[PDB]
Amino acid sequence: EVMLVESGGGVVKPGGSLKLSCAASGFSFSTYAMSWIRQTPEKSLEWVAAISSGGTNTYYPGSVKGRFTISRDKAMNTLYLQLSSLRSEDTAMYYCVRHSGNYVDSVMDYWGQGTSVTVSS
Amino acid sequence: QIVLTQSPAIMSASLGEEITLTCSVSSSVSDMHWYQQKSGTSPKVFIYSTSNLASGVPSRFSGSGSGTFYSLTISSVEAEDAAYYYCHQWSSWTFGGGTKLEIK
Amino acid sequence: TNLCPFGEVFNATRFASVYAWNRKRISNCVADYSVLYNSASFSTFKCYGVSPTKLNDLCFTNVYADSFVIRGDEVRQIAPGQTGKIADYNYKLPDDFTGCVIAWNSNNLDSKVGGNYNYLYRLFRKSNLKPFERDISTEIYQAGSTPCNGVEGFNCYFPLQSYGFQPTNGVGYQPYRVVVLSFELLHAPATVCG
Amino acid sequence: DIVMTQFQKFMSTSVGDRVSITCKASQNVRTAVAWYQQKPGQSPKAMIYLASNRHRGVPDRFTGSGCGTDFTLTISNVQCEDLADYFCLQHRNYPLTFGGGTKLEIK
Amino acid sequence: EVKLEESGGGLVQPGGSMKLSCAASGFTFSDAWMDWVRQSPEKGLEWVAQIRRKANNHATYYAESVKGRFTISRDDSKSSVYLQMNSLRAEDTGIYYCIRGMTYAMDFWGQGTSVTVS
Ligand SMILES: *[C@@H]1O[C@H](CO)[C@@H](O[C@@H]2O[C@H](CO)[C@@H](O)[C@H](O)[C@H]2NC(C)=O)[C@H](O)[C@H]1NC(C)=O
Structure with a gap:
């Protein structure tokens, strides 16, 4: 069985820094490209970060490029997406997502549960 | 910039009737995957590469399409298949709109 | 030991369009395909009739490298037998091919802000x-x-x-620089060995 | 002028079948024929341009092929979405003439 | 979003004049070849006129049934095309559609405008 659990989500005022974690267990880790997918509260999914299998090529969309950073640790078998310069439209629920191949072109097999990041106050 | 439009926003079928979910693309893409999100769980995967089924999905769901129009077809809709359906492709940076399905 | 020039067809500053690809005749080399296979920067390394680990233990007569730039979603159409807008009208591979198709993302170089x-x-x-x-x-x-x-x-x-x-298009609509190595064996002395 | 003869004004096929609508011409219009679908109450949306190509957002079922004088538009897996009229026109010379029209109704 | 909307919905006595206007926006109006097509209940679909793009000297091609009674004029600054009709007849009845570009890609059609004679 494959399990993808997230953490780190909470409440932060605009301009803060927040680091999400995703502990992966149940498969051979560094031979599958992984990605993060957020869900805005109108229930409209979108990519927010995607990393290939070797941890070399990371792709961010145009709205969050330069402030979001993905990371990949083969040693302790987690996955990080740390945030910076949060606007008022970054309220979402961030899913941990594993692809089926060693690149980001394949299909997203198993999704995590996701822990929300709500920016206010 | 690829936009992925699904028509309409909300569908509704009766118990046992067939229904076809549409996902029209702006310009040409290769294939299209289809996801299903229930109420309060994460989305899962049903169809990849427009014609294959995932492991454990009931065998009433079928797919078709190439180019700029893709279809998800359910043979006999029963009460469990009442959830959102997002179509995503590798070249979009956003998912589809998501067509809800509710039992009549 | 004079190694073969791959450092002007791979990391070149500007490739050519797909409707006029660059065909480069490579001969009288000692090539090193194992340096290419273990670079971990390419995203598609598919050999279509030879083994990639046994590339060094082969003596050919000419090796032809075809460089062009396509979308990321269209690298599938550089396969033997596939069809589409690229394989039918731009660059067609035969279904007796013996070569390795190489591709990598090139969004940092082949994309401008306008x-x-x-x-x-x-x-x-x-x-x-x-x-x-x-x-x-x-x-x-x-x-x-x-x-x-x-x-x-x-x-x-x-x-x-x-x-x-x-630069904001999608990982399948970003420019993917593709180079296609094609091995030909005529009736001649074999010189491209490695 | 070039006239398009479209002699089938009524085609009666059930759901999930294959229909082939023909568009005869009187002189050799080379490849310049377009196909139009007009749902009742709307304006015609374009299906085929230059007698073989397919538009954006039209399904894979709608395919048309042929050259010379006798063209065809063949649909497969006819759903309930395809209850409409199908027109063809030529655009080789400037008196552009449309066809008659082929109405489909479900059995 | 590409859209085309027409005007001039009315009835005229045979011998009047009616100037239809088609305002378009959402695309580059300089390079677009826009026709006007006619739908009548008795004679089916017909083709009325055609104005071309800027690089083709703003050419006008009418059908030979409406020569001298139909002129078409475009203006890319206001992004609209006009179909001025004078000395109308009994068989000019029908709906007049304004399209973006016929027989290629971007083949959008308008919605039409009912023109009747008494
Ligand atoms: C194209 O140029 C790059 C930049 O030099 C090459 O990358 C180098 O590859 C060698 C071979 O392993 C490494 O030792 C260097 O450290 C790399 N340079 C870096 C990472 O800056 C690349 O190999 C060249 N392409 C080919 C086909 O030779």
């Missing part, structure tokens, strides 16, 4: 391309019965459309 309109592709043709044939003919195809004398308003459509390359 749009890079230097990469073109062929939209239609009279017939399908027989394999390994380029066709650089910018003619307006003359649909209709009146000679239109070099316009584009009605029929007399232009055959080449430009790629729309922005």
Whole structure:
């Protein structure tokens, strides 16, 4: 069985820094490209970060490029997406997502549960 | 910039009737995957590469399409298949709109 | 031991469009394909009839490397037998191929903030391309019965459309530089060994 | 002028079948034929341009092929979405003439 | 979003004049070849006129049934095309559609405008 659990989500005022974690267990880790997918509260999914299998090529969309950073640790078998310069439209629920191949072109097999990041106050 | 439009926003079928979910693309893409999100769980995967089924999905769901129009077809809709359906492709940076399905 | 030049066909500053790809005859080398296979920077390394680990233990007569730039979603059409807008009208591979198709993302170089309109592709043709044939003919195809004398308003459509390359497009619509190594063995002394 | 003869004004096929609508011409219009679908109460949306190509957002079922004088538009897996009229026109010479029209109704 | 909307919905006595206007926006109006097509209940679909793009000297091609009674004029600054009809007849009844570009890609059609004679 494959399990993808997230953490780190909470409440932060605009301009803060927040680091999400995703502990992966149940498969051979560094031979599958992984990605993060957020869900805005109108229930409209979108990519927010995607990393290939070797941890070399990371792709961010145009709205969050330069402030979001993905990371990949083969040693302790987690996955990080740390945030910076949060606007008022970054309220979402961030899913941990594993692809089926060693690149980001394949299909997203198993999704995590996701822990929300709500920016206010 | 690829936009992925699904028509309409909300569908509704009766118990046992067939229904076809549409996902029209702006310009040409290769294939299209289809996801299903229930109420309060994460989305899962049903169809990849427009014609294959995932492991454990009931065998009433079928797919078709190439180019700029893709279809998800359910043979006999029963009460469990009442959830959102997002179509995503590798070249979009956003998912589809998501067509809800509710039992009549 | 003089190694073979791969450092001007791979990490070049500007490739060519897919409708006029660059064909480079490589001969009298000692090539090192194992340095290419263990670079971990390419995203697609598919060999189509040879083994990638046994590339060094092969003596060919000519190796031909074809460089072009396509979208990320269209690297699937550089396969033996596949069809589409690229395999039919731009670059056709035969279904007895013996070579390795290499590709990697190139969004940092082949994309500008206003749009890079230097990469073109062929939209239609009279017939399908027989394999390994380029066709650089910018003619307006003359649909209709009146000679239109070099316009584009009605029929007399232009055959080449430009790629729309922005840095915010999607991982399948970013420019993927593709190089296709093709091994040919004539009746001649083998010199490309490695 | 070039006239398009479209002699089938009524085609009666059930759901999930294959229909082939023909568009005869009187002189050799080379490849310049377009196909139009007009749902009742709307304006015609374009299906085929230059007698073989397919538009954006039209399904894979709608395919048309042929050259010379006798063209065809063949649909497969006819759903309930395809209850409409199908027109063809030529655009080789400037008196552009449309066809008659082929109405489909479900059995 | 590409859209085309027409005007001039009315009835005229045979011998009047009616000037239809088609305002378009959402695309580059300089390079677009826009026709006007006619739908009548008795004679089916017909084709009325055609104005071309800027690089083709703003050419006008009418059908031979409406020569001298139909002129078409465009203006890319206001992004609209006009179809001025004078000395109308009994068989000019029908709906007049304004399209973006016929027989290629971007083949959008308008919605039409009912023109009747008494
Ligand atoms: C194209 O140029 C790059 C930049 O030098 C090459 O990358 C180097 O590859 C060698 C071979 O392993 C490494 O030792 C260097 O450290 C790399 N340079 C870096 C990472 O900056 C690349 O190999 C070249 N392409 C080919 C086909 O030789």
